[PDB]
Amino acid sequence: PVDVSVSIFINKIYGVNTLEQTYKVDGYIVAQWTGKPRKTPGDKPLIVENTQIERWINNGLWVPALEFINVVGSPDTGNKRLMLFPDGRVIYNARFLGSFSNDMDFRLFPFDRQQFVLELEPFSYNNQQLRFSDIQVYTENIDNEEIDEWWIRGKASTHISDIRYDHLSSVQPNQNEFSRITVRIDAVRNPSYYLWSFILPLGLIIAASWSVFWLESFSERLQTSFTLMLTVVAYAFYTSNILPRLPYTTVIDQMIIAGYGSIFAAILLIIFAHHRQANGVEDDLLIQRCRLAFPLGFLAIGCVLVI
Amino acid sequence: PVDVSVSIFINKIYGVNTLEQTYKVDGYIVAQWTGKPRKTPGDKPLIVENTQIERWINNGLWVPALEFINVVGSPDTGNKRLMLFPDGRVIYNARFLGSFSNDMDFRLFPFDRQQFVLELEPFSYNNQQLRFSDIQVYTENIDNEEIDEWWIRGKASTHISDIRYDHLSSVQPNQNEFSRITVRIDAVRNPSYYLWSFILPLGLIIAASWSVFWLESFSERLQTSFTLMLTVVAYAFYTSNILPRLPYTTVIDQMIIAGYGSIFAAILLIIFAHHRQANGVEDDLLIQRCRLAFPLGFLAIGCVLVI
Amino acid sequence: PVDVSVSIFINKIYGVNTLEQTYKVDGYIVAQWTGKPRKTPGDKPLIVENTQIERWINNGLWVPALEFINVVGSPDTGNKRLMLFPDGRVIYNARFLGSFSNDMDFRLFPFDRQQFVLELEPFSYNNQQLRFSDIQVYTENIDNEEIDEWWIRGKASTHISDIRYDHLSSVQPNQNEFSRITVRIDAVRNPSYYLWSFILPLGLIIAASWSVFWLESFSERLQTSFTLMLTVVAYAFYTSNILPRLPYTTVIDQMIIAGYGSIFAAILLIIFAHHRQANGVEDDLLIQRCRLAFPLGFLAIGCVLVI
Amino acid sequence: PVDVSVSIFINKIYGVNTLEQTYKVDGYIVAQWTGKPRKTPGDKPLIVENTQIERWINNGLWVPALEFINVVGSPDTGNKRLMLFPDGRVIYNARFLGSFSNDMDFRLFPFDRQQFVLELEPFSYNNQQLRFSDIQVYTENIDNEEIDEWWIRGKASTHISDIRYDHLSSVQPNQNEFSRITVRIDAVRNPSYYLWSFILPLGLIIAASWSVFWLESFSERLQTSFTLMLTVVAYAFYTSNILPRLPYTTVIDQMIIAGYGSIFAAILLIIFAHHRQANGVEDDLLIQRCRLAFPLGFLAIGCVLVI
Amino acid sequence: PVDVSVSIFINKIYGVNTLEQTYKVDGYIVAQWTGKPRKTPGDKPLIVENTQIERWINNGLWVPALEFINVVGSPDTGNKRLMLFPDGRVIYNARFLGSFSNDMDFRLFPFDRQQFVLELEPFSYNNQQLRFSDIQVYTENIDNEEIDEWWIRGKASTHISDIRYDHLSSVQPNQNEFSRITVRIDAVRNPSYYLWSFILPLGLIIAASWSVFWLESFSERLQTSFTLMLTVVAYAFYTSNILPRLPYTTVIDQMIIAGYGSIFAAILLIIFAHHRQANGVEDDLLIQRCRLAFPLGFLAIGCVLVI
């Protein structure tokens, strides 16, 4: 098995589409291996640009096709370069732009911690024909930066493993294990924008739904409650596009449900206060003085639901 | 007829666009057949990468073009590999990303049960020239997983049939039957997000439209009703993008119509209560105590309409 | 002029974008003509797959390029096949996905009746060099089906005509007429979704604007009217994306204008009622009992405007 | 300099994206020039289809590359045809779909008058090597039609000029002037849709903000004013997508600002009326009878701002 | 090292997508270098069009591939031209359309000052093999113009530097420095549209939240406050699409937060006024006369937050 030394330089990461859980990676890949010696004009290495590598591959030069496992379709490969040496070593440099998909878990949407994963693998040659010796990733352009809403922390973790494929077991009996390179970049989401745009007004409206009971009239308090519920409906569609449809509830959705439940609890308390008048002449004092105990109970509810 | 053994490995399914009823499938296809023996350098099989298969096809190697029947346009084929053996067998491996369309029935939108269908067929060679022996599908990557909002249940059902085409009957008199492979993956939609985001507040507003009659003033009750109807209008456009335009009504649309009908019934009951005053001095008691019978009747209506 | 027999098989029609009046057609085309006899290996026809036709065209085989007149740019041609016979006949089969544009008239938006038109023409050879003998269209996949919101009725009408081009008259003096094939598929829109989603609540709000006059207070009736007008504004943007900007008014837009006019007429009637008090002590009876004549007049207005 | 006679046939114009000021043009181009005589099989001209012109260009046939100056990127060229004659004349016919950008001035958005400009130029050969003799444009398909919201008036004006480029002056000392063809098609926007959808309800709400002062209560008049201002906010986002962000104000934006200013003037007049009570017992008559002078002044304001 | 003289002509800049911080640049590039002398037919230079350069590169002509560092994927290169001279100089002209990304800082969103940066670099040849002598940029088409919402000021600054790459240090020990060209075009955003569309109504609503205290009733003042807060919620989604999610607050977002805080301060002041009644018979005068001091304090707050 020929040994290939890979080096990935991550130029930038952007386009983090949290809806489809794909992110765009732009960068360069430098694969390097050693082959049989060849005659090169002069005592200098020979550089072969793009759309000129095809003549060398047609003549019979062994250039492996390294694909990305977790890419969406095909990467938009820009330029490629093949640098050949007289002693036998080959260096294949290429530039890639790819849409990569990783399993993202948005259980804590604003304070999220994800990792961007690049999985690289030979498409044809298995570990008995191609072995990845080492990979070192130079993510120095975005080592400690803020790309769009994500802080990149530290360096990029690298791993080299062997993947056994069962769909190639019927066509290749024993030799179906492929050498795979995994590159993980840990990123934390910047929670500032959601903190001052999607959490603070929701807290203000929750406190307003707390304050609806300070009136002394039933029907005007009801129209107040319904205008508040229309405002919670307004944030229902103001905050719908920022996240996909997940079975669990994040903090934003928990606060939206908290607003709905607070308005419904207010309406039920008003109705029971109207029903509490046994003869229609007795007023309400204790059930109308819940303007301070309901904030305490709802603060306890929020403290449970956030953690 | 040469016998071709196909093996499809579904790497991932995503991008389930319920509006156009297309889904994106990424995976690999391994077709395998047996041809006439050829001389290969050494006692090892020969691997031909992408854009090098074209030289073999120009020299005269028989490589069938397997197309997808239900694909949108053309798949974004990435790498392809042709592995040739001295005893005569040929293995064509390829990677595909495709937008596939299937007839989806959204009569039960949140609790939906669909199936993703891959239909594969030779474009040129009929069943007298190319016969699919068997297909076994390894959907092990997504065998029991949750891709975006869908649970994949069990394995993938496979079927091999013969399709008779009438447009090729005029050009091919008797031999126009094509061997087709059908792969069906049964998926169930995760109904959680719609349950806590699109159903529960609609139930709260339906109960609120029940509770509008607890006031003792006509005009303020009317403005309450109109603010509620504006809120139902707010969910009219808050829930419009999640589903195409279908002749039938799903649960979400049935609840939206239920909210509209409940507000209109409330307005008609208020107006008939105002019309019930024969001399303008008699009040309303029975028609104003419908705050409990109307919930019962509307619960019966909802129990009928959901089932 | 060589005679070409065309056969179009419409696999599916979808993506009917009423805004730009384009629709996506997926299908197959089978052109067939007769040429000079050639020697074929064996006593069987020879099948040439895609990217292998180019060698035959370079060697000198006459394969006409049939283009689509009403296509948006270029179709996404998938596979193509060229089947050659020893007696001389050539059959060119191809698969196309195209965005086609037709002049659509949305004067009756929900109850619309459009036709999808495929116009096919040789790009280079005129009627003195290429003549279309006949076309028969097998739209059996969607003969009587519901694609997205359209019922396809009957079979597909076909026509063969000759088009004289004036831009080629300066370069070709007399021979500039091209044989054209036109295929028309008549489709009717399913009006159910707009009936229970875009028409019924508008009728309910029109009846509500009828019912605004049942109050006995001027200012609360005014705020009722303004909340209703805000609801009509809510349907202004709830129903804006479903149709392009046309000079005429459809039923949905006529009902939106009806709602605006009904609210404005209500406001003017309230203001004239306030102005009708000559001394400020006389009340209003006839102008305040218009809660039944205004529905009759507006029903007559709607009966005129729908038809 | 060889003389080239160009003829552009505009099949259709569509996709007028007023946000980015680009429009899609579909059509055909017929360039014609005269070269050295050549031997052609028979006494008939020879027609060379697409992907067969490349062999003639490789053999040494002079085919100029006419590019579009104001195109977005590259046009989607469909088929191309090269018709060669024995006497020496060459006719290059091609089909183009292009996104073209022109400097559009939306100072009068509904009653706009724009022009669609096609600028054609040789990419390599200057006026000393290639001269455009004449261009005549056959826009007969859309001569007097309504494409999407635009009326096309008259024929297409054509012009042939010489452009001197300063970036090629350093590489070409004196010969850097290129022959350019400019085609201008004057179009007027259909203002009907904006008239009955974006102007009339704004006038109704302006008249409603005029009518807010007919009440006799301060606070209810204030909530009336705030509901009206919320409605003007509703048209703020109902009419935001139809036009880009321009420094100047169009009629729609002037009416939106008129609505905002009318509501603010109403609020200030109410507040000054509340402040006009010196002892709290004197009422307001003149400042409360501004329900007719304010319409006159605002009509004068609108008459100034529209013109 | 061969010396290359580059000249970039910026035809237009458009599509400034502030969300992803990319802008589209259309233009031409003219690289020029001097090579070994060659024999050309006649005493005139030879012009090689697009898809004919490939034959010269296959024969062995040295044409460097200049890539754009900050481009999104690959530019849509249109035509290219290679002009060869008998004395040895080569001129490579090309047209590019590219999506370029630069680090944009939107701390002052309407009054923003950005710079569009074009970074050009050889993909293969380092500074010991390729050196950029000089670049002069002719941005005369957009020297002093308004493209979409940006004024371009002055000329384009140019710089030539050397970049040392650490990912190529392992494969190239000492010679890994690349000659880079940087072109910066300073642009200022036109702040007019945001001034009369996104700032002025926010100021009017802030003044309205100032004016809410002029009433003498608690509950109606509360519903007034809640309708105002619903209007601020309406601008929450009316102004969400114009800018990405940034950790800091711009002027528009600061005014939105100012509106939220003003409504919440109004609600707290009303509640404390209701709580200030010790026995329920004493009224409020000083806390109800804050209709003038609160504007002064909020004007001071706004004067601090804008600067």
Q: Between D and E, how many residue pairs show a Cβ–Cβ distance under 8 A?
A: 140
| Gap between the Cα atoms of E93 and D73, Å rounded | 16
Task: Check CB contact of E54 with chain A, cutoff 8 Å.
Answer: yes
Q: Tell me phi and psi for residue E136, to 5 degrees.
A: -125, 130
With CA atoms as reference, the chain B residue closest to C90 would be B171
Task: Check CB contact of D234 with chain C, cutoff 8 Å.
Answer: yes
Task: Check CB contact of C47 with chain B, cutoff 8 Å.
Answer: yes
CA distance C128 to chain B (A): 25
| Gap between the Cα atoms of D36 and B61, Å rounded | 43
- Quote the tokens at residue B29: 């296809």
Place of tokens 């050639």: C38
Task: Check CB contact of B149 with chain C, cutoff 8 Å.
Answer: no
A57–B76: do the CB atoms touch at under 8 Å?
no
User: Closest by alpha carbon to C209, among C157, C156, C270, C151?
Assistant: C270
Distances from the Cα of E39 to the Cα of C161, E45, E305, angstroms = 56, 10, 71
D229–E207: do the CB atoms touch at under 8 Å?
no
CB atoms within 10 A of CB A202: 21
The string of DSSP codes covering E109-136 is: STT-EEEEEEEEEESS--TTTEEEEEE-
Cα angle, residue A169 at apex, residues A167 and A175 outer, rounded to 5°: 125
Amino acid residing at D257: I
Distances from the Cα of C236 to the Cα of A232, B43, C151, C230, C233, angstroms = 21, 75, 28, 9, 5
Distances from the Cα of C20 to the Cα of A88, B72, C107, D243, angstroms = 58, 20, 15, 18
Answer whether E43's CB lies under 8 Å from E89's CB. no
| Gap between the Cα atoms of D40 and D52, Å rounded | 16
| Gap between the Cα atoms of C222 and C293, Å rounded | 20
Which residues in chain D are contacts of E81 at CB distance < 8 A?
Answer: 123-124
Answer whether B65's CB lies under 8 Å from C50's CB. yes
| Gap between the Cα atoms of C48 and C55, Å rounded | 10
| Gap between the Cα atoms of E256 and A200, Å rounded | 12
Sign, Cα dihedral of D212, D214, D219, D224: negative
Task: Check CB contact of A236 with chain B, cutoff 8 Å.
Answer: yes
Answer whether C35's CB lies under 8 Å from C3's CB. no
Answer whether A105's CB lies under 8 Å from A243's CB. no
Task: Check CB contact of A125 with chain B, cutoff 8 Å.
Answer: yes
| Gap between the Cα atoms of D177 and D173, Å rounded | 11
CB atoms within 10 A of CB C121: 18
A73–B237: do the CB atoms touch at under 8 Å?
no
What are A122's strand-pairing partners? A66
D271–E227: do the CB atoms touch at under 8 Å?
no
DSSP state of D143: T
Burial class (CB in 10 A: 0-12, 13-18, 19+), A259: buried
CB atoms within 10 A of CB C129: 16
User: Closest by alpha carbon to A45, among A93, A87, A3?
Assistant: A87
| Gap between the Cα atoms of A161 and A150, Å rounded | 28
| Gap between the Cα atoms of B120 and B64, Å rounded | 12
DSSP state of B71: B
| Gap between the Cα atoms of E132 and E180, Å rounded | 7
Resolution (angstroms) stands at 3.3
| Gap between the Cα atoms of C140 and C152, Å rounded | 11
| CA torsion, ordered B215, B216, B220, B221, to nearest 10 deg | 50
User: Closest by alpha carbon to E113, among E104, E122, E103?
Assistant: E104
B201–A260: do the CB atoms touch at under 8 Å?
yes
DSSP reduced 3-state for B8:
strand
Strands (E) across E55-112 are located at 66-68, 80-84, 89-101
With CA atoms as reference, the chain C residue closest to B67 would be C79
Could you tell me whether strands B66-68 and B2-17 are parallel, antiparallel, or unpaired per DSSP bridges? unpaired
D154 Ramachandran zone, left/alpha/beta (phi>0; psi -120 to 50): left
Q: Tell me phi and psi for residue B274, to 5 degrees.
A: -65, -35
Sign, Cα dihedral of A267, A271, A276, A280: positive
- Quote the tokens at residue B17: 């666009």
Amino acid residing at C154: G
Residues with Cβ within 8 Å of residue D48, at least 6 apart in sequence: D56, D81, D82, D83, D84
Strands (E) across chain A are located at 2-17, 22-34, 46-48, 66-68, 80-84, 89-101, 113-122, 130-135, 150-152, 157-164, 177-189
CA distance B147 to chain A (A): 9
Which residues in chain A are contacts of B216 at CB distance < 8 A?
Answer: 219
Instruction: Tell how many helices (H) and how many strands (E) occur in chain B.
Output: 6, 11
| Gap between the Cα atoms of E121 and B191, Å rounded | 52
SS (H, E, C) chain C: CEEEEEEEEEEEEEEEECCCCEEEEEEEEEEEEECCCCCCCCCCCEEECCCCHHHHHHHCCCCCCEEECCECCCCCCCCEEEEECCCCEEEEEEEEEEEEECCCCCCCCCCCEEEEEEEEEECCCCCCCEEEEEECCCCCCCCCCECCCEEECCCCEEEEEEEECCCCCCCCCCCCEEEEEEEEEEEEECCHHHHHHHHHHHHHHHHHHHHHHHCCCHHHHHHHHHHHHHHHHHHHHHCCCCCCCCCCCCHHHHHHHHHHHHHHHHHHHHHHHHHHCCCCCCCCCCCCCCCCHHHHHHHHHHHHHHC
Answer whether E270's CB lies under 8 Å from E222's CB. yes
Task: Check CB contact of E238 with chain D, cutoff 8 Å.
Answer: yes
Amino acid residing at D161: S
Q: In the complex, which subunits touch A with 3 or more CB pairs below 8 angstroms?
A: B, E
Which residues in chain D are contacts of C167 at CB distance < 8 A?
Answer: 7-9, 28, 30, 138
Burial class (CB in 10 A: 0-12, 13-18, 19+), A281: exposed
The length of chain E in residues reads 307
| Gap between the Cα atoms of A154 and A185, Å rounded | 8
Task: Check CB contact of C28 with chain B, cutoff 8 Å.
Answer: yes
E228–D226: do the CB atoms touch at under 8 Å?
yes
| Gap between the Cα atoms of C151 and C147, Å rounded | 7
| Gap between the Cα atoms of D2 and E220, Å rounded | 84
Q: Where are the alpha helices (DSSP H) in chain E?
A: 53-59, 192-194, 200-211, 218-238, 251-276, 293-306
Distances from the Cα of B45 to the Cα of B38, B42, B144, D266, angstroms = 11, 8, 36, 88
Answer whether E179's CB lies under 8 Å from E122's CB. yes
Q: Tell me phi and psi for residue D30, to 5 degrees.
A: -125, 100
Chains E/B: 3 or more C-beta pairs closer than 8 A? no
B49–A67: do the CB atoms touch at under 8 Å?
no
Task: Check CB contact of E227 with chain A, cutoff 8 Å.
Answer: yes
DSSP state of D305: H
| Gap between the Cα atoms of C97 and C78, Å rounded | 8
B123–C81: do the CB atoms touch at under 8 Å?
yes
Experimental method: cryo-EM
Widest Cα–Cα separation across chain D: 110
Place of tokens 């399709």: B163
| Gap between the Cα atoms of B222 and B231, Å rounded | 14
Answer whether B9's CB lies under 8 Å from B28's CB. yes
Which residues in chain E are contacts of A193 at CB distance < 8 A?
Answer: 245-247
- Quote the tokens at residue C288: 């305040």
| Gap between the Cα atoms of E74 and E97, Å rounded | 9
| Gap between the Cα atoms of C89 and C85, Å rounded | 6
Rg of the Cα trace of chain B?
30
SS (H, E, C) A30-76: EEEEECCCCCCCCCCCEEECCCCHHHHHHHCCCCCCEEECCECCCCC
Q: Between A and E, how many residue pairs show a Cβ–Cβ distance under 8 A?
A: 135
User: Closest by alpha carbon to E40, among E52, E48, E49, E31?
Assistant: E48
Amino acid residing at B29: I
Burial class (CB in 10 A: 0-12, 13-18, 19+), D173: exposed
D267–E208: do the CB atoms touch at under 8 Å?
yes
E166–A32: do the CB atoms touch at under 8 Å?
no
Answer whether E228's CB lies under 8 Å from E212's CB. yes
CA distance B43 to chain C (A): 31
Residues with Cβ within 8 Å of residue E42, at least 6 apart in sequence: none
Rounded to an integer, what is the distance from CA E196 to the centroid of its chain? Answer: 21
Distances from the Cα of C301 to the Cα of A8, B155, C139, C235, C261, angstroms = 71, 60, 43, 20, 11
Query: Which of E106, E121, E171 best probes binding to A when mutated, by most A CB atoms within 10 angstroms?
Result: E171
CA distance C248 to chain B (A): 24
SS (H, E, C) C144-179: CCECCCEEECCCCEEEEEEEECCCCCCCCCCCCEEE
Residues with Cβ within 8 Å of residue B244, at least 6 apart in sequence: B18, B19, B20, B21, B106, C148, C149
CA distance E43 to chain A (A): 31
DSSP state of B165: -
User: How many CA atoms lie less than 13 Å away from C25 in the CB half-sphere?
Assistant: 28
- Quote the tokens at residue E148: 């979409």
| Gap between the Cα atoms of D277 and D282, Å rounded | 6
The length of chain A in residues reads 307
E88 Ramachandran zone, left/alpha/beta (phi>0; psi -120 to 50): left
Q: Tell me phi and psi for residue E10, to 5 degrees.
A: -85, 105
Task: Check CB contact of B74 with chain C, cutoff 8 Å.
Answer: yes
D28, D55, D223 ranked by CB distance to C58: nearest:
D55
Q: In the complex, which subunits touch E with 3 or more CB pairs below 8 angstroms?
A: A, D
Kindly list the structural domains of chain E, giving each domain's residue range(s) and its CATH number in brackets, ordered by start: 1-190 (2.70.170.10), 191-307 (1.20.58.390)
User: How many CA atoms lie less than 13 Å away from C27 in the CB half-sphere?
Assistant: 24
Could you tell me whether strands D2-17 and D130-135 are parallel, antiparallel, or unpaired per DSSP bridges? parallel
E166–A140: do the CB atoms touch at under 8 Å?
yes
Burial class (CB in 10 A: 0-12, 13-18, 19+), B272: exposed
